[PDB]
Amino acid sequence: IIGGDECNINEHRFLVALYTSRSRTLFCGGTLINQEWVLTAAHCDRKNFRIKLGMHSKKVPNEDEQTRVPKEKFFCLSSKNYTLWDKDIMLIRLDSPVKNSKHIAPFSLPSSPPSVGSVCRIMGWGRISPTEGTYPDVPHCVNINLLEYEMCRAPYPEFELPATSRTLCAGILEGGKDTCKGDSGGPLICNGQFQGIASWGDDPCAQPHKPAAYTKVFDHLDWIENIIAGNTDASCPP
Numbered sequence: 417i418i419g420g421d422e423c424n425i426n427e428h429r430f431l432v433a434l435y436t437s438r439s440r441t442l443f444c445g446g447t448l449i450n451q452e453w454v455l456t457a458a459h460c461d462r463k464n465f466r467i468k469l470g471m472h473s474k475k476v477p478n479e480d481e482q483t484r485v486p487k488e489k490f491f492c493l494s495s496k497n498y499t500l501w502d503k504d505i506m507l508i509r510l511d512s513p514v515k516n517s518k519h520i521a522p523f524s525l526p527s528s529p530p531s532v533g534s535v536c537r538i539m540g541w542g543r544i545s546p547t548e549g550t551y552p553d554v555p556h557c558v559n560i561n562l563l564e565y566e567m568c569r570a571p572y573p574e575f576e577l578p579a580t581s582r583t584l585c586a587g588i589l590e591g592g593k594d595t596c597k598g599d600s601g602g603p604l605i606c607n608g609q610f611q612g613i614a615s616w617g618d619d620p621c622a623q624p625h626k627p628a629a630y631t632k633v634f635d636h637l638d639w640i641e642n643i644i645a646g647n648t649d650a651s652c653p654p
């Protein structure tokens with residue numbers, strides 16, 4: 417996360433870290449949405465990975481950290497394909513439930529739709545330098561604005577982005593605050609609700625007028641609810 421500061425140790429109880437099984441290299445964030453399910457991005461999928469819950473500092477672990485692994489992973493399509501404007505979502509059922517603790521608690525799915533002009537917060541253990549390779553020991557947090565999706569189209573002519581999407585466009589027009597490498601898959605919290613999943617942004621991060629795309633959680637409520645209810649034939653919004 418560029419342009420923020422270390423998160424308060426109590427403000428990210430739902431934030432989880434995806435890391436490799438062997439080197440313990442952190443590669444994405446994610447969000448605990450109840451006692452046994454996590455939402456992250458489809459681009460975060462790996463054949464083998466672990467999920468750390470209740471983590472703040474990497475080297476000075478919270479006493480109540482828990483580790484889980486995916487028992488099941490769900491995607492919009494059997495191909496697990498996604499695009500720059502939709503389908504970048506993965507729902508994970510944990511191998512066993514977690515109990516709430518000082519540093520662990522889920523973020524409920526959103527109950528209202530996101531409103532343009534809201535102020536949102538992002539958080540993760542990604543790079544805190546727009547260019548370098550400075551990865552923090554603790555997660556950082558920063559506030560950004562929810563923009564009209566139309567805003568995300570013009571800055572990226574190479575992607576020929578369609579007029580509508582299943583993503584939210586968020587950032588700061590003047591630059592300086594942004595998601596960055598290692599934060600993707602993590603949550604975008606807007607006006608108190610879990611509204612986005614970090615999908616992609618530009619590199620270097622936090623450039624002026626280069627906002628980032630976050631998969632729109634709200635549009636996927638039916639799909640999420642149906643999978644959790646045990647309807648595996650559920651479909652993402654067309």
Ligand SMILES: *[C@@H]1O[C@H](CO)[C@@H](O[C@@H]2O[C@H](CO)[C@@H](O)[C@H](O)[C@H]2NC(C)=O)[C@H](O)[C@H]1NC(C)=O
Pocket residue numbers: 495497
């Ligand atoms: C999922 O996406 C992959 C990669 O974008 C698709 O595989 C490509 O298919 C096209 C032709 O259909 C070829 O040009 C590429 O060589 C393929 N592989 C690549 C780029 O690695 C695939 O079609 C998609 N799967 C679906 C739609 O089921």
